Design an enzyme around this catalytic site. Structure first.
Site, PDB file in Angstrom:
ATOM      1  N   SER A 195       0.875  -1.149   0.000  1.00  0.00           N
ATOM      2  CA  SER A 195       0.000   0.000   0.000  1.00  0.00           C
ATOM      3  C   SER A 195       0.900   1.182   0.000  1.00  0.00           C
ATOM      4  N   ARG A 196       0.865   2.012  -1.075  1.00  0.00           N
ATOM      5  CA  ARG A 196       1.895   3.000  -1.303  1.00  0.00           C
ATOM      6  C   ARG A 196       1.997   4.005  -0.196  1.00  0.00           C
ATOM      7  N   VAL A 197       0.855   4.555   0.255  1.00  0.00           N
ATOM      8  CA  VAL A 197       0.843   5.560   1.286  1.00  0.00           C
ATOM      9  C   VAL A 197      -0.085   5.108   2.365  1.00  0.00           C
TER      10      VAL A 197
END
Lengths: 51, 58, 499
Positions: free
Chosen positions: C366-368
């Site tokens: 989950s990138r951020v």
């Protein structure tokens, strides 16, 4: 009880729907089919002059 | 009963709920028989307590 | 009653006005019609044919316009009169779409009559700029452990859910909607997501099961369902995600938090492929047209966590990608992956092999996502991903003799994996996930024999509530595990371990 009540309204509506179809077939028989073309004609005369 | 048209059942169950709104009685009633178990228990409790106190100092 | 409503409707038929209408259909079939006239026509208009069906003008060409029929070709025929709606494709948007199933024309397929809708808004709308965009801070809680822990999910984000067909594909998302019943049936509108379930390309029967489940969990009232079933026409399917997102944007542009799950964008690709081919525009890789990237990207970036200026609205996207064989290099999946923040790849092999829900931890990112997590779920879940990527390593090389260090990790790891699993269509509360993760992390579940793990969970939770639900109330409000709470919880958890 509420659910079937809604169902009865829907059933009534589809019954009255096939009655609308029956009334349409009757309308298109009449020479109201002819006479109402005159009504549309004068209505279009009024309408298009209102344009 | 502001949407039902197949009426005369909302008053029925209104009356059935408000009728049996007094539901069957409270189940506080074991406190004589529950107290008796506590008596038996107490007899045993005191026996253990006095015995071991005596034995400890012995 | 039925007579009065019909009579009101009949009365509402009243006169037709003159205006620029009428093109005449010529070459028609192949789901596009070539119309003669329509001299002044806005681009991407909605036209309604006198075949009683509507289409979106696509190609405005010198002397001809090529409508694309948004609907069945059966009723359209040569030399029919095409009348200009005169308006670009817009769909009703508003507040009253909540708890109403609608199809792609916005027709109430819940059949609860006309939908209350504040406005209508154009189907294509550009994504908000850099300046309206505030970095995520509020989480979305799915109520499934590891899907909040290992995969941290937060509002606004385009958080991909990728995996293989009918692995109860829908269920992961349904559980999210269900967990957020608690918060959405809350009174705080900052804690209200208004969640939209876009059902594209699914059997109408299946959708009816979904609808029935949602109404069983009484979840219909906070959610909209848009439907574009498999039978329903491909151009309608093409416009189906875009329209849904417009509705979502009305909530977002009320500054109110929302979420949209696009099930399944892979089927939109097949639809756009069909459409493109029938427009005889050249095909791309895997026969999916070259503007397929544009199609997905324009759709996806409309989902965002806006800034304070825009009232900090969210529209959290969860797009559901159906991989053909777990073809993770396949053109459509890779294109989606590049757009999306993170992946939530679901491990099919493990799913079959009795891990429900099965999350391929390696292929979930989950990138951020992790700064959306609340501090309780950062502290308690601290390094559990690493630990279970030590379990991942450990069981990699487990396949002879095991050193006690390795064995300890394996014993914990295997047991921890058991802990992750959840019963399909029954998600846990957010509050409840905090202690469970606490237990294993703080090594309380190290000793617990494998057979009793399920028992441990239920009993532990019951224990916590009965002994002191006060702790849980505190962690519920504080949302941060204080040192006192941490110690108290260590003590309490140890107490449960004993029993």
């Amino acid at each position: 009880w509420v659910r079937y009540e809604a169902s009865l309204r829907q059933l009534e509506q589809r019954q009255l729907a096939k009655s609308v179809i029956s009334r349409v077939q009757s309308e298109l028989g009449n020479p109201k089919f002819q006479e109402k073309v005159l009504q549309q004609s004068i209505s279009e005369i009024e309408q298009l002059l209102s344009k | 009963r502001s949407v039902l048209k197949n009426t005369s059942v909302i008053d029925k169950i209104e009356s059935y709920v408000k009728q049996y709104k007094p539901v069957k009685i409270d189940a506080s009633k074991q406190l004589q028989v529950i107290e008796s178990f506590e008596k038996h228990a107490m007899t045993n409790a005191k026996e253990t307590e006095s015995l071991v106190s005596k034995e400890l100092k012995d | 009653e039925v007579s009065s409503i019909l009579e009101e409707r009949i009365k509402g038929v009243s006169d037709e006005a003159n205006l620029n209408e009428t093109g005449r259909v010529l070459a028609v079939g192949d789901g596009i019609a070539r119309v003669f006239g329509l001299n002044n026509i806005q681009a991407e208009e909605l036209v309604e044919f006198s075949s009683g069906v509507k289409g979106m003008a696509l190609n405005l060409e010198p002397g001809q316009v090529g409508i694309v029929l948004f609907g069945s070709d059966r009723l359209v025929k040569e030399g029919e009169l095409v009348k200009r709606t005169g308006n670009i494709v817009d769909v009703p948007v508003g507040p009253g779409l909540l708890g109403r199933v609608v199809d792609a024309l916005g027709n109430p397929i819940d059949g609860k009559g006309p939908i209350d809708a504040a406005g209508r808004s154009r189907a294509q709308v550009k994504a908000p700029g850099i300046l309206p965009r505030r970095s995520v801070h509020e989480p979305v809680q799915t109520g499934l452990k590891a899907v909040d822990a290992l995969v941290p999910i937060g509002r606004g984000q385009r958080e991909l859910i990728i995996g293989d067909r009918q692995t109860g594909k829908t269920a992961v998302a349904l559980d999210t909607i269900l967990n957020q019943k608690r918060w959405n049936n809350g009174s705080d509108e900052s804690k209200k997501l208004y969640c939209v379930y876009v059902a594209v390309g699914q059997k109408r029967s299946t959708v009816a099961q979904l609808v029935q489940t949602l109404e069983q969990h009484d979840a219909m009232k906070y959610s909209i369902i848009v439907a574009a079933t498999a039978s329903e026409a491909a151009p309608l399917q093409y416009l189906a995600p875009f329209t849904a997102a417009s509705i979502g944007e009305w909530f977002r542009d009320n500054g109110k938090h929302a979420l949209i799950v696009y099930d399944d964008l892979s089927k939109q690709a097949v639809a756009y492929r069909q459409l493109s081919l029938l427009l005889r525009r050249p095909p791309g890789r895997e026969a999916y047209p070259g503007d397929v990237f544009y199609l997905h990207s324009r759709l996806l970036e409309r989902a965002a966590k806006l800034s304070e200026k825009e009232g900090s609205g969210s529209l959290t996207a969860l797009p559901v990608i159906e991989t053909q064989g777990g073809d993770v290099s396949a053109y459509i999946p890779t294109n989606v992956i590049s757009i999306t923040d993170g992946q939530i790849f679901l491990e099919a092999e493990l799913f079959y092999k009795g891990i429900r829900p099965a999350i391929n931890v390696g292929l979930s990112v989950s990138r951020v996502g992790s700064a959306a997590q609340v501090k309780a779920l950062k502290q308690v879940a601290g390094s559990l991903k690493l630990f279970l990527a030590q379990y991942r390593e450990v069981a990699a090389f487990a396949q002879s003799d095991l050193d006690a260090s390795t064995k300890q990790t394996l014993v914990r790891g295997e047991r921890l994996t058991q802990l992750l699993k959840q019963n399909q269509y029954s998600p846990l509360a957010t509050e409840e996930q905090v202690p469970l993760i606490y237990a294993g992390v703080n090594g309380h579940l190290d000793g617990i024999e494998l057979s009793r793990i399920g028992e441990f969970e239920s009993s532990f939770l019951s224990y916590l509530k009965s002994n002191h639900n006060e702790l849980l109330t505190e962690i519920r409000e504080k949302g941060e595990l204080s040192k006192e709470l941490l110690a108290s919880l260590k003590s309490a958890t140890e107490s449960f371990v004993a029993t």
